[PDB]
Symmetry: C3
Subunit: 45 residues, 3 copies
């Protein structure tokens, strides 16, 4: 029974790491879009 | 004590689903903005 | 084994709060990018 709980915790932790990885990728892409908007507006203005 | 562990695990799993859902929605909108920036670069510049 | 479980649960909860705070920040900046793309389109095209 202790292992069943421990396995659950492992699964959650693993899922949390994947989520953290996803959020980092999202932040990078979001920063790219910020840069692209900045670049577009710069070339015009 | 075991009750608290079981309850907290359920809360964590629910919050994780909430987070995954928020991430899904963020990703779709981010893909839209990437597309819009691409269109503006071409159509303006 | 119960203490170990409880410590990991606390760690997971702390991380979930951090993640929720990251998502809040991402959402705000993403809303600004949506507005900026809208603005460039409106002003020029």
């Amino acid at each position: 029974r202790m292992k069943q709980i421990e396995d659950k915790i492992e699964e959650i932790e693993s899922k949390q790491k994947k989520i953290e990885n996803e959020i980092a990728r999202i932040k990078k892409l979001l920063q790219l879009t910020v840069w692209g908007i900045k670049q577009l507006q710069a070339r015009i203005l």
